[PDB]
Backbone:
RNA sequence: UAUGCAAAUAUAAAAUUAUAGUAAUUAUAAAUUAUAUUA
């Protein structure tokens, strides 16, 4: 566990750099097309004349945000012969 | 269409900030700002032309096909009466260059050089802005372009055709032309690589 | 006054001189001249980061004018003080009575809060603050905690 | 004198001094770049 | 010192070098300050 | 017995630096040239009279992370935590003040609002103004100056 | 010169005395070996001995990190597929292709997303090799015997508590119900080993 | 050609290498460069020479009068490093020096933790990186 | 505590009777916010995905 | 499964074996050895 943690932190410390380069890319898009335009591209309701349009858009966002129940997979239990491990959830060999 | 996620904003990195006087939430139904900035002009242009966007000015001149700067310059010289004829074309060029990148032209390179040497030395401690200017102005040089070509060359960025082009660019020299163009210690490399250099840079 | 050429604001200068002359190598007077000279130029001469506001001065220019009005070219101590006596006599409204920034002689404590606290060690704190000493208008039956 | 001046005469090239005073000039492959023209001496080889 | 006050009035305070050198215009200045991350240390002959 | 693959070619993690350190070459070359039989390379002709720094020592020999070994590669904030908190608060209350000197690159031969404002802040504190009011007062100073400027502009 | 200082003409350049007695070590580190591949002990990528190392144990889980192809793998679209499944199960009189359109939109984006993540991850492999990995040069930290010294420090403590006597000794395990099955006069709970 | 790599390190890999326009530090850099070319010195040795070279007494405490976190501006470094390659005869065609020194920096600008380097892989050592992953290398 | 509580009958020998009530006190972390410090490798790559798609 | 009895790796040592005469040594660790569901 300890070892893999110290791996994860490295990965993450890199992915925050990747995410930064992305956000930076987004900035360059901003000063190519102008800020407002970019906001338009991102779903800004500048075309909303009246509240009914707003409530349509937000009704859309509501129907997205509502979370359908997640069916989360549980790994099956593997029954081996003399059962060196009854923790066995995979077919890999283990060091007992 | 919407993302595969809907999240809140990513946290702000230490040292990172939204630039000053920059409206971050601005929408197209916001009222037009009064001044002329790349931002204000690009949002404006979005409202006027719709979604027409061009990488550079010559791309615009590509889309209009046969309309030179000065021709339009006459339209604007008509509209704003007190402008000159020169300032009328200038107005066009400045608007286009605000909506897109600045033009690449010998004229503007010359103007840049002329101002650079009209200012002279500066009171900066290490003559900082002058080393800035100098280091920049050599990026536009012939020799620099030749070097850029040799560098992309080293990375195998050409094809067979580029090669046969380089070859027959070489065959066109005489021993005399070699003796003259080897004086610069660079320019003969440019005579051979001219088309390929022009290809990478453009 | 040009009594000396050299001035520095650097902490523990002496250590730095020591360690700088440790890294030096030869004894030839060319070398010595340069090492000493470079030391001087980089620290003790004020080429950079120095202003006239910042150097400590008793004779700051109004004061110079005053001194030369009083003490310059006077052939006795007696002449000096009947001169002085005649200068004390000037009104506050005369042209020739000129002002200057005075350097404030520093206070001991530097702030009023410090004044109170400093005063407070010669005194006895009350167990209760002034607003609750006086018994309440209601009555609080004291129980165990 | 910790760091003495050593040999300062430039009247020939380093390779000419090396050539004349050293057998080492005859075996250019056996010497690294930092020592190439630098030796004025004859060297014995002893194979242990 | 019972008496010396004559001198005390034209006397001079010592100048504020600490903040003057603090507030000097600097070429590393940043609009928002970030503390540096941790540097690699030496974990011993096996770890490096 | 399983071991990490490259342990055969594993470097000595304590001593692998020694070989390359400038002093070593100074000494060795020093007694090589002294012989009379070696033509000194030019770097030696130079650092002969400008020998390298004394007390820069590796971290391998001194096992201290906190030792700042090099006069060159050192990074330690000149800013004490109090200052840090101060100009950080000033900076976050207005972005204009923070960006003014350095928007793109740092222009270091011009004064900066962050600094001028810190100066007059301390000035206010020693005239007995408390924290909050001193900050908002200095900020008002900046904003009013800017008001002048853009009135002129209009 | 024309190539590395740690590699000469015939193979890895043999510095320590181990190399001169055992010079198989210079030219062969495994079946992923080439001649340019000496001195760079890691071999290409997707190749034998290409795996980067972290404190000596190799990194074989990379895809599992970015959540491409793992059991714990990140899923892009769930709400869509669930919504569509619900639609299918409810009734057959009305058929909704609206749901299948929202979904196939979602997927159409997902493709490019994934190629992006993969690319970024390969960049991570490169960075990890440059600035982190020791190239299998340091001792494993990931199995308890590697930490023996740590445990020793603890055994020592339990010894000094015992008057510096019983090292590695532990209390005798008693019985499931030793406390309530024993008569007065016999120890009902396990004592310190020195106390026996 | 490895020369350009070395110079890239002296320019970008060193916080506060003094004022690099001054004839003193400039001469340090010049000499060390000519000693990396012509193989008289290891790159590692010449680098550690450069950063350990003698600059000015109480160096850090003069550095507190300019720098906050001890990171100077990188213009003087690159202008000097190009100057040295021009005044030494390093290249047959004059421009190439400046171009390469510039280009190699621009490419590294995009990399995660760009101006730091692992000390073992930074320069010549027994074990090396593959020619694609070498740092200021032409093959990246 | 758990020991005492158990032998006095004030806490069950297995199970957490307050499990739901206690959820306010635990930092439940929304997948929508990003905590720069996590050992979660999923959340990081999720936000990376999000911004890239943006 | 710690009321009898029971010193004992946590190191003070002089080449291996061997009850302290037998044989001539022994012990040792990173070279090399094809299949463990990664985009
Ligand atoms: Mg085994
Ligand atoms: Mg092996
Ligand atoms: Mg293998």
Residues:
């Amino acid at each position: 566990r300890r070892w893999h943690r110290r791996l994860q932190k490295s990965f993450i410390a890199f992915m925050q750099f990747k995410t930064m380069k992305v956000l930076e890319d987004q900035a360059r898009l901003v000063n190519t097309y102008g800020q407002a335009a970019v906001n338009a591209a991102l779903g800004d309701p500048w075309n909303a004349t009246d509240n009914v349009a707003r409530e349509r858009k937000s009704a859309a966002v509501r129907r997205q945000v509502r979370a359908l129940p997640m069916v989360n997979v549980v790994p099956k239990h593997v029954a081996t012969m003399k059962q060196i491990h009854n923790d066995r959830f995979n077919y890999r060999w283990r060091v007992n | 269409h919407g993302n595969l996620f809907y999240f809140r904003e990513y946290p702000m990195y230490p040292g990172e900030y939204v630039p000053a006087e920059h409206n971050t939430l601005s929408s197209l139904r916001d009222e037009l700002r009064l001044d002329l900035t790349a931002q204000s002009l690009k949002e404006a242009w979005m409202r006027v032309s719709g979604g027409v966007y061009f990488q550079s000015v010559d791309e615009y001149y590509a889309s209009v096909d046969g309309l030179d700067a000065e021709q339009i310059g006459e339209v604007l010289a008509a509209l704003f009466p007190e402008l000159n004829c020169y300032e009328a074309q200038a107005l066009v060029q400045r608007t286009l260059e605000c909506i897109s990148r600045p033009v690449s032209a010998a004229s503007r390179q010359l103007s840049r050089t002329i101002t650079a040497e009209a200012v002279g030395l500066d009171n900066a401690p290490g003559h900082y802005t002058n080393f800035l200017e100098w280091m920049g102005r050599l990026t536009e040089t012939r020799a620099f372009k030749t070097e850029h070509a040799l560098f992309e060359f080293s990375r195998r960025k050409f094809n067979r055709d580029d090669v046969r082009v380089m070859f027959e660019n070489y065959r066109l020299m005489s021993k005399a032309t070699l003796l003259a163009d080897s004086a610069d210690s660079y320019s003969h490399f440019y005579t051979v690589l001219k088309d390929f250099a022009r290809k990478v840079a453009g | 006054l040009g009594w000396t050429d050299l001035f520095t604001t650097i902490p523990d200068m002496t250590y730095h001189i020591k360690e700088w002359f440790d890294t030096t190598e030869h004894m030839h007077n060319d070398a010595v001249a340069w090492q000493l000279g470079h030391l001087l130029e980089t620290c003790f001469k004020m080429k950079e980061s120095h202003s006239s506001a910042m150097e400590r001065a008793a004779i700051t220019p109004t004061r110079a004018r005053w001194v030369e009005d009083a003490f310059a070219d006077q052939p006795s101590v007696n002449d000096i003080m009947r001169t002085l006596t005649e200068i004390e006599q000037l009104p506050f409204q005369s042209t020739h009575n000129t002002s200057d920034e005075s350097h404030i002689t520093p206070y001991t404590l530097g702030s009023v809060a410090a004044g109170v606290q400093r005063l407070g060690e010669h005194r006895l704190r009350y167990t209760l603050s002034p607003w609750d000493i006086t018994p309440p208008e209601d009555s609080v039956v004291l129980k165990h905690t | 004198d910790l760091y003495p001046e050593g040999f300062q005469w430039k009247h020939k090239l380093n390779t000419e001094y090396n050539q004349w005073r050293s057998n080492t000039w005859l075996t250019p492959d056996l010497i690294p770049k930092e020592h190439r023209g630098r030796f004025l001496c004859n060297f014995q080889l002893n194979i242990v | 010192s019972i008496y010396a006050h004559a001198l005390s009035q034209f006397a001079v305070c010592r100048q504020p070098w600490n903040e003057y050198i603090g507030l000097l215009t600097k070429q590393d200045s940043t609009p928002y300050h970030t503390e540096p991350q941790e540097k690699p240390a030496y974990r011993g002959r096996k770890q490096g | 017995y399983k071991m990490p693959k490259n342990m055969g070619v594993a470097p000595r993690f304590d001593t692998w630096n020694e070989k390359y350190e400038p002093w070593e070459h100074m000494k060795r070359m020093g007694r090589l040239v002294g012989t009379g039989f070696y033509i000194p390379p030019e770097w030696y002709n130079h650092f002969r009279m400008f020998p390298p720094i004394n007390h820069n020592f590796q971290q391998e020999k001194t096992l201290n992370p906190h030792n700042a070994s090099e006069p060159t590669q050192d990074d330690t904030s000149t800013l004490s935590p109090e200052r840090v908190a101060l100009r950080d608060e000033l900076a976050r209350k207005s972005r204009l003040v923070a960006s003014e000197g350095m928007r793109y690159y740092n222009i270091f031969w011009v004064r900066k609002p962050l600094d001028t404002m810190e100066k007059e802040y301390y000035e206010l504190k020693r005239r007995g103004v408390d924290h909050g009011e001193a900050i908002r007062k200095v900020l008002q100073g900046f904003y009013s100056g800017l008001a002048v400027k853009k009135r002129v502009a209009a | 010169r024309q190539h590395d200082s740690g590699v000469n003409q015939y193979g890895l350049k043999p510095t320590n005395a181990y190399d001169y007695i055992n010079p198989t070590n210079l030219i062969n580190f495994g079946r992923g070996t080439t001649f340019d591949n000496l001195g760079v002990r890691r071999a290409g990528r997707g190749e034998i001995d290409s795996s980067p190392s972290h404190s000596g144990s190799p990194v074989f889980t990379q895809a599992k990190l970015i959540g491409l192809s793992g059991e714990e793998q990140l899923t892009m679209c769930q709400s869509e597929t669930m919504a569509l499944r619900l639609c299918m199960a409810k009734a057959g009189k009305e058929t909704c292709e609206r749901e299948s359109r929202a979904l196939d939109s979602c997927l159409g984006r997902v493709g490019h997303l994934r190629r992006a993540m993969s690319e970024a991850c390969w960049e991570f492999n490169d960075w990890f090799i440059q600035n982190v990995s020791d190239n299998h040069t340091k001792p494993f930290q990931h199995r308890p015997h590697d930490w023996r010294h740590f445990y020793a420090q603890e055994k020592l403590v339990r010894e000094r508590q015992q008057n510096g006597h019983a090292y590695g000794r532990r209390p005798k395990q008693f019985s499931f119900g030793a406390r309530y099955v024993k008569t007065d006069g016999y120890g009902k709970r396990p004592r310190l080993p020195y106390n026996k | 050609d490895d020369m350009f790599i070395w110079l890239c390190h002296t320019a970008m890999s060193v916080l506060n290498p003094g004022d690099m326009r001054s004839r003193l530090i400039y001469n340090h850099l010049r000499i060390l460069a000519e000693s990396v070319a012509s193989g008289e010195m290891t790159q590692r040795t010449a680098f550690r020479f450069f950063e350990s070279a003698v600059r000015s007494p109480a160096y850090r405490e003069i550095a507190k009068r300019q720098l906050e976190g001890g990171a100077a501006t990188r213009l003087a470094g690159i202008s000097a490093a190009a100057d040295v390659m021009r005044r030494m005869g390093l290249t047959r065609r004059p421009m190439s020096s400046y171009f390469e020194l510039y280009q190699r920096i621009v490419e590294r600008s995009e990399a995660m933790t760009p101006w730091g380097f692992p000390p073992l892989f930074q320069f010549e050592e027994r074990l090396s990186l593959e020619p694609r992953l070498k740092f200021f290398s032409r093959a990246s | 505590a758990k020991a005492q509580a158990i032998r006095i009958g004030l806490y069950p020998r297995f199970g957490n009777p307050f499990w739901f009530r206690s959820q306010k006190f635990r930092p439940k972390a929304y997948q929508e916010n990003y905590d720069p410090t996590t050992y979660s490798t999923k959340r990081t790559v999720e936000h990376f995905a999000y911004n890239w798609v943006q």
Summary: The two ends of chain A are 17 Å apart (CA to CA). Helices of chain A lie at 2-33, 35-41, 51-65. Residues 2-33 of chain A form the longest helix (32 residues). Chains A and E do not touch (no CB pair under 8 Å).
